[PDB]
Amino acid sequence: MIVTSGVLVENGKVLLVKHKRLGVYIYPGGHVEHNETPIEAVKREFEEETGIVVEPIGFTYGIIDENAVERPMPLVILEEVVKYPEETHIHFDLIYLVKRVGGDLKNGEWIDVREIDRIETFPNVRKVVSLALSTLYRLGKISKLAA
Amino acid sequence: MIVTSGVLVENGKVLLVKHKRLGVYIYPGGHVEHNETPIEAVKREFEEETGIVVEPIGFTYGIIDENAVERPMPLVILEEVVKYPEETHIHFDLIYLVKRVGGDLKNGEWIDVREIDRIETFPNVRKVVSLALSTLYRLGKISKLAAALE
Ligand SMILES: [Ir+3]
Ligand SMILES: [Ir+3]
Ligand SMILES: [Ir+3]
Ligand SMILES: [Ir+3]
Ligand code: NI
Ligand code: NI
Structure with a gap:
């Protein structure tokens, strides 16, 4: 089963939610529905589970046509x-x-x-x-110390 | 739909197949089925479409437990x-x-x-x-280096 998760770190804290059945803390996320992309799924699940709206970020070569x-x-x-x-x-x-x-x-x-x-x-x-933390540092969105 | 593709380049040549519906050349690939991971899907699709057996390669931090x-x-x-x-x-x-x-x-x-x-x-x-091609050039550098280290 393909699933997706979102890792949101702000000011040295990470936003976690409790897994419905396991009861342990996890990153917000869930199964990618058949009618959505993993990107749409992580945004949808993060908002439904926390009320927070997010955008996935990360590396891209920049292809768009x-x-x-x-x-x-x-x-x-x-x-x-x-x-x-x-x-x-x-x-x-x-x-x-x-x-x-x-x-x-x-x-x-x-x-x-x-x-x-x-x-x-x-x-x-x-x-x-x-x-x-190492990645946010590599984007400079955070200092090495913070990472 | 989530789909997957495999890029196989050897000796300056890339293996392409004719798209099933459009005919235009494309890397082998296809839909990921409910019962499989994209890794399994690309290996299955590549073999079914070309007869060639492959293994996906790529960056990993190395997490396994x-x-x-x-x-x-x-x-x-x-x-x-x-x-x-x-x-x-x-x-x-x-x-x-x-x-x-x-x-x-x-x-x-x-x-x-x-x-x-x-x-x-x-x-x-x-x-x-x-x-x-750029990626393979870099991977080729890393393996020649690992080999030289012997
Ligand atoms: Ir184009
Ligand atoms: Ir034909
Ligand atoms: Ir297809
Ligand atoms: Ir562990
Ligand atoms: Ni489940
Ligand atoms: Ni199609």
């Missing part, structure tokens, strides 16, 4: 295992760095990136925030 | 608008650089990149092949 438009590269792509009692699912997760462009927080919690070890999170949440 | 395995980044992701008079298709195309690992050519043509500006290709194929 009358026939196609290049979309930003995910921060990372992890093929993840989720084990339910009845069956194990495999999530091909396109994880996108995102930025806030609107909305207002209605659900979710801003977690200090250095205190992530204090809350129960889905596997790799910590490694991924580390990747996000 | 009991809970997840990182998969290679696509060479580029293009959200394509494919217009037919009947219907327009929106293809979110994960384009992977791939390497040959087996099979045998049964369909498709190895196209000399030096001739591609006079060959009718699907939109953006030429820009994508140029990215593939």
Whole structure:
């Protein structure tokens, strides 16, 4: 199942929500519906789950012509295992760095990136925030110290 | 629809197939089915369409543990608008650089990149092949370096 996640980091904090069935903290995200692109899906899910409107950002070579438009590269792509009692699912997760462009927080919690070890999170949440901090730094949206 | 494509370049030539509906030359690829990952889909489509067996290659940070395995980044992701008079298709195309690992050519043509500006290709194929060539040049540098380190 192809899914997508959005990693929003502001002022040393990352916005996480609790997974519906697992009850651990995760990046907002979810399954990419058959009728939407992963980009539309991550924006949709981030807003529905937190009330915050975002835009995926990241690297692109800059291709755009009358026939196609290049979309930003995910921060990372992890093929993840989720084990339910009845069956194990495999999530091909396109994880996108995102930025806030609107909305207002209605659900979710801003977690200090250095205190992530204090809350129960889905596997790799910590490694991924580390990747996000290094990336925001590579874009200069953040100082190396902040990263 | 999410789709995937495989860019295979060997000795200055890129392997292209005629688009199933448009005829124009394009990298092998196709839709990702409900039961598979884009990685599996590109390997399946490439073999079905050309007879060649490939493996996607690309950047990875190297994350792999009991809970997840990182998969290679696509060479580029293009959200394509494919217009037919009947219907327009929106293809979110994960384009992977791939390497040959087996099979045998049964369909498709190895196209000399030096001739591609006079060959009718699907939109953006030429820009994508140029990215593939730069990327392969860099990967070739990294492996020769790893080898020299012996
Ligand atoms: Ir772990
Ligand atoms: Ir023909
Ligand atoms: Ir197709
Ligand atoms: Ir064009
Ligand atoms: Ni699920
Ligand atoms: Ni089609």
